[PDB]
Amino acid sequence: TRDQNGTWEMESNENFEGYMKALDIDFCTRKIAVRCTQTKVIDQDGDNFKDKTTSTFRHHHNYDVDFTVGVEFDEYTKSLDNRHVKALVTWEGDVLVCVQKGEKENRGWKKWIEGDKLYLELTCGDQVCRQVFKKK
Amino acid sequence: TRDQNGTWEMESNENFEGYMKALDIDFCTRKIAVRCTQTKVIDQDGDNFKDKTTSTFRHHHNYDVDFTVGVEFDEYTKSLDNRHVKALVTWEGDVLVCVQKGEKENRGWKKWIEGDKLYLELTCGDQVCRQVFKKK
């Protein structure tokens, strides 16, 4: 049949990456594109076609870590760089301090409550990242 | 206080990029990561901690094409390789065939209905991508 009308959702995709490589599309764009869902809405009247394609990309991470203050533990940083570190969490006053011994120097974090907000500082090398959290 | 229990929503995030760079996380991953919402659930029993961090990002784009079988039209392949092609669609039996005339050789696609599924094969050079769609 020549009637292609419908709302069409992709259920299988094969060699999308090879096709995109042949288009000289960069590795980054290919990595995102291949993870997209696709919906095609085809509105066809005879030989007249209106094709509306929607591409969706979703990213979702859960990262669970359990530890006891003062007991060195093994950490696998799966929601970041996916490296093995040996982490030691201690208290310095009211600040929770973690050193992550491993490949990177100066790697760790500090976490404390101030003014009913949670403060986190992550360090790696000469880089410090500062994050602030609100109670939901 | 040393009580860090709570469901915490991130409201400020500064020098995340420099930190991820120091961890050798690539630009492709960083552009996704800086746009994720972050929720940290801290369940703390004395010096025993369970930290659950959730991070989520959603994005979509659209790609619309209108054409008539047998009428050549200009197509700009936005969200693919961003080139101008001269597209000519014809029927070969019940198979809809497009040639995208332009810089890439052997560039085109074929689209047909079989059973109740839509089949698409996109070609560029010697690379063929095959996609299958079900009616939703």
- Tell me the helix content of chain A: 10-25%
Largest sheet of chain A: 6 strands, antiparallel
- The termini of chain A sit apart by 55 Å
Instruction: Write the H/E string of chain A, N to C.
Output: EHHEEEEEEEE
Task: Indicate the CATH architecture of the largest domain in chain A.
Answer: Beta Barrel
Q: Helical region count of chain A? A: 2
Global shape of chain A:
elongated
The quaternary organization reads as: homodimer
What structural class results from the helix and strand content of chain A? mainly beta
Function (chains A, B): Intracellular transport of retinol.
Keywords (chains A, B): Cytoplasm, Retinol-binding, Transport, Vitamin A
Main location (chains A, B): cytoplasm
Organism (chains A, B): Homo sapiens
Give your account of this protein's structure.
- The structure is a homodimer of 136-residue chains.
- The first copy, chain A, has two helices and nine strands; from the N terminus they run βααββββββββ.
- Chain A has 136 residues and is mainly beta.
- Chain A has two domains: 6-56, Calycin beta-barrel core domain (Lipocalin); 73-133, Calycin beta-barrel core domain (Lipocalin).
- Chain A has a six-stranded antiparallel beta sheet with strand order 4-5-6-7-8-9, with no helix packed on it. A three-stranded antiparallel beta sheet of chain A has the order 1-2-3, with no helix packed on it.
- The longest helix of chain A is centred in the first third of the chain and has 7 residues, at 16-22.
- The first copy, chain A, starts with 5 loop residues before the first strand and ends with a strand.
- The relative contact order of chain A is 0.10.
- Chains A and B meet through strand 1, helix 1, helix 2, strand 2 and strand 3 of A and strand 1, helix 1, helix 2, strand 2 and strand 3 of B.
